[PDB]
Design a protein around this ligand. Structure first.
Ligand code: RET
Ligand code: LFA
Ligand code: LFA
Ligand code: LFA
Ligand code: LFA
Ligand code: LFA
Ligand code: LFA
Ligand code: LFA
Ligand code: LFA
Ligand code: LFA
Ligand code: LFA
Ligand code: LFA
Ligand code: NA
Length: 269
């Protein structure tokens, strides 16, 4: 079966029900729509925070631009890649199209991950850690996590062993990032108001959950085993839903909370 991602595989073999095709289209559209809304939010509220914090708002806005453009591209790629067959009454991979391509999302991650990790360092103050050290660790492990993930996904269909091994390597970098971010949160909570500490607690939980959704969605088609319930259009729907929840959470909600933290920090006098 010529296609080499899971979406194309399902599209070429079983096809997508009307519901699966339309749901996925709508959730991807909601994704980019929220980023555009977020972009305007972060621009318009930039004056609500003190100058010293504004780099966080700037980085949120730039993340919104990248996410809007690339998630818009991904959404159009979805609808362009699958076309209705009247005889069967399902949507199949269109040989006339460009085929579904995970590249848009992975590029978004490569760009956004370093900016999301960076931006908290303009709101919290470290204690015993160095800014440059934390930044460098975030950026190195962030890049390596996405690169190794991207290598992995090439083997999603063709070599489950490679897919899982590269995934595990990627997960090692992810665990490093979690370790560093937890340290940043802990140092950030030192020497701020309890209201600020509460927001940071919430940021940590949001970060932990929203970022873990990504490897969840990576594994999704296989979480019920091969020829499992999720090894299907339902796995495709679940993956894209989970990615979209993760995107809104990790980018928009995260940015909103950091803005709220910045506002709170200024209230001590
Ligand atoms: C706005 C986009 C963000 C915050 C993207 C984050 C992406 C990840 C945390 C990806 C993690 C992965 C693993 C930990 C293992 C499987 C491969 C990845 C790349 C999905
Ligand atoms: C299909 C069109 C959906 C576009 C809606 C975008 C709404 C953005 C709000 C700022
Ligand atoms: C508390 C912050 C006020 C409410 C934040 C609204 C965020 C809107 C972002 C566009 C989706
Ligand atoms: C669409 C997003 C709308 C954001 C409006 C936020 C208003 C803040 C004014 C300071
Ligand atoms: C291969 C497994 C990788 C596990 C995590 C590696 C973390 C290495 C940290 C490198 C820090 C470099 C600072 C610029
Ligand atoms: C791949 C990205 C690796 C980034 C490592 C740090 C880059 C910035 C170096 C600053 C020196 C302190
Ligand atoms: C046939 C088994 C293929 C396993 C590939 C694993 C690649 C790991 C690279 C480190
Ligand atoms: C497979 C996942 C392996 C996890 C190994 C953890 C890598 C190091 C992260 C811990 C940081 C300690 C400073
Ligand atoms: C999808 C991410 C949901 C996590 C939000 C929880 C943040 C507040 C915790 C209390
Ligand atoms: C379908 C995605 C499943 C991932 C669950 C996310 C919750 C992670 C919380 C820390 C572990
Ligand atoms: C149902 C269980 C799903 C949990 C999988 C989430 C992804 C875990 C990867 C951690 C690196
Ligand atoms: C449909 C998706 C809606 C996106 C939600 C973004 C709004 C986040 C609100 C966070 C407010 C926190 C106040 C402390
Ligand atoms: Na179509």
């Amino acid at each position: 079966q010529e296609l080499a991602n899971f979406e194309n595989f399902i599209g070429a073999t079983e096809g997508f029900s009307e519901i699966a095709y339309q749901f996925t289209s709508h959730i991807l559209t909601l994704g980019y729509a929220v980023m555009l809304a977020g972009l305007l939010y972060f621009i318009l509220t930039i004056k609500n925070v003190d100058k010293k914090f504004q780099m966080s708002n700037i980085l949120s806005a730039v993340v919104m631009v990248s996410a809007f453009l690339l998630l818009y591209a991904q959404a159009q790629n979805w609808t362009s890649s699958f076309t209705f067959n009247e005889e069967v009454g399902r949507y199949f991979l269109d040989p006339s199209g460009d085929l579904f391509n995970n590249g848009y999302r992975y590029l978004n991650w490569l760009i956004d991950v370093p900016m999301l990790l960076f931006q908290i360092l303009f709101v919290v103050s470290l204690t015993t850690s160095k800014f440059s050290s934390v930044r460098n660790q975030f950026w190195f492990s962030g890049a390596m996590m996405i690169i190794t993930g991207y290598i992995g996904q090439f083997y999603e269909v063709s070599n489950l062993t490679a897919f899982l091994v590269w995934g595990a390597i990627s997960s090692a970098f992810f665990f490093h990032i979690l370790w560093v971010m937890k340290k940043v949160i802990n140092e950030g909570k030192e020497g701020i108001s309890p209201a600020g500490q509460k927001i940071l607690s919430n940021i940590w939980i949001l970060f932990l959950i929203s970022w873990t959704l990504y490897p969840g969605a990576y594994l999704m088609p296989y979480l019920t085993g091969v020829d499992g319930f999720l090894y299907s259009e339902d796995g495709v729907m679940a993956r894209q839903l989970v990615y979209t929840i993760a995107d809104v959470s990790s980018k928009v909600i995260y940015g909103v909370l950091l803005g709220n933290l910045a506002i709170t920090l200024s209230k001590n006098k």
